[PDB]
């Protein structure tokens, strides 16, 4: 008669690593790394991402004519922009402090577009011939929809003196621009006056732009340039424009209704017609694991990203042959 002390064994093949020995087979273990994703951009907490598709934050916000899909876009969870969106600045130029603006959007979930200066209101200037072949809509030369490219009327550009007071409770994102002409003849032709300026002023802002003339390679069929500027107009503050030429005026400016968690995700992917609690630029994630290795940039309630291929914890003991 005898009694023995022993321990559990089973048919498990699961292996764990230790410091002194690799691929040790154990009776029980626990994987803690999420290795899979659905492969799709998805709604986040039921809330649809703003997907720009071929358009870019610039295309959208200036109102590129081929970004018509994105007028009055609803509240978004996050934004998705391609690496090289084709429909950007259709009329070549620059967007001043673009990255600082994009960064501002990571704090924003919804814009409400409103008209601050009506196109009709430009009685002493021509407001409807301000277009180019570079930004084309429906086969016809058009232009960034949210800003008016003002030109001279009966050979005269009288000084513009305009002022908008933000009576809304919100911060207002105001956009405008300056046009840089190819040559002196082009300047006089478009605006009559040879020496021009745009003074913009708020409680903080103290701007005065002048057009830089230079000979430039055609981009999108034009050698002329448009430099775009922005500000946040606080509530109960007023913005003051004054110019005698080369002024691209605001028509509509965006109201900032919801601030909160958001992100500009960078992906070539399109909408998946799905929903998730955790999204990555490669696809969405659904797991209880504490870790994953899909992609570092995520949004939502997610496991922690690690570069590991394998994370497996021993729970059971060393399993026998």
């Amino acid at each position: 008669d005898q009694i023995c002390i022993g321990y559990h064994a089973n048919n498990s093949t699961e292996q764990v690593d230790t410091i002194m020995e690799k691929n040790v087979t154990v009776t029980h273990a626990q994987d803690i790394l999420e290795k899979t994703h659905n492969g799709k951009l998805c709604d986040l907490d039921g809330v649809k991402p703003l997907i720009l598709r071929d358009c870019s934050v610039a295309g959208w916000l200036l109102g590129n004519p081929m970004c018509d899909e994105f007028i009055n876009v609803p509240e978004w969870s996050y934004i998705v922009e391609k690496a090289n969106p084709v429909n950007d600045l259709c009329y070549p130029g620059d967007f001043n402090d673009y990255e600082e603006l994009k960064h501002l959007l990571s704090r924003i979930n919804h814009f409400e577009k409103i008209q601050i200066i009506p196109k009709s209101s430009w009685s002493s200037h021509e407001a409807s011939l301000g277009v180019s072949s570079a930004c084309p809509y429906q086969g016809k030369s058009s232009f960034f929809r949210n800003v008016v490219w003002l030109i001279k009327k009966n050979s005269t550009y009288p000084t513009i003196k305009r002022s908008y007071n933000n009576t809304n409770q919100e911060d207002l994102l105001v956009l405008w621009g300056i046009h840089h002409p190819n040559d002196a003849a082009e300047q006089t032709k478009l605006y009559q006056n040879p020496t021009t300026y745009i003074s913009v002023g708020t409680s903080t802002l103290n701007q005065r732009l002048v057009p830089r003339i230079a000979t430039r390679s055609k981009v999108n069929g034009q050698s002329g340039r448009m430099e775009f500027f922005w500000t946040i107009l606080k509530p109960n503050d007023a913005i003051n424009f004054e110019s005698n030429g080369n002024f691209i005026a605001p028509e509509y400016a965006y109201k900032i209704v919801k601030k909160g968690d958001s992100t500009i995700m960078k992906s070539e992917l399109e909408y998946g017609n799905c929903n998730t609690k955790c999204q990555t630029p490669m696809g969405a994630i659904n797991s209880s694991m504490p870790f994953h290795n899909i992609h570092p940039l995520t949004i939502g309630e997610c496991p922690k990203y690690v570069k590991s291929n394998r994370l497996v914890l021993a729970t059971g003991l060393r399993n026998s042959p």
Binding site: D1, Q2, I3, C4, I5, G6, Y7, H8, A9, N10, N11, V16, D17, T18, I19, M20, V24, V26, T27, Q30, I32, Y98, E99, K102, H103, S106, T263, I264, M265, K266, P290, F291, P296, L297, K304, Y305, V306, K307, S308, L311, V312, L313, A314, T315, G316, L317, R318, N319, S320, P321
Partner: protein
Amino acid sequence: GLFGAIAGFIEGGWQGMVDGWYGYHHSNEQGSGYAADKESTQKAIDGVTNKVNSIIDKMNTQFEAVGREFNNLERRIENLNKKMEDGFLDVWTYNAELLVLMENERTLDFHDSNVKNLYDKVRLQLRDNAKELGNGCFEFYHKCDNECMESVRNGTYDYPQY
């Protein structure tokens, strides 16, 4: 392993013991069988659960990357930003893999320790009333029926009786 029991003087595990991690196998005139030791087993389940949770929670607060964009003449800070993000991922990846490696090793030895301690616990009861076979078994000098076997698992083996 560190404690010498698992895959040691006890050469192998038991496919026949499914009710626990550690236990006893008896054999006498009336038959033989496996019986899990609940106390040591439950102790182990608690130890390892807490461990897994402890590991999960320590990693809870860890670096998170954000999208930040830089124009063509901000290459230095773009680079700085990339290195910073990469740097933290590397640090936290290392933390995770090391922890798993180190604790995995501790977990196996923990099980080994529990088997040995259980063995010693039994050894210390039987004393000179049984032969230590060298393999995890004790061969009794007296007949030991199921009542007798039960008293060994009990902690109750009456040494002065036998």
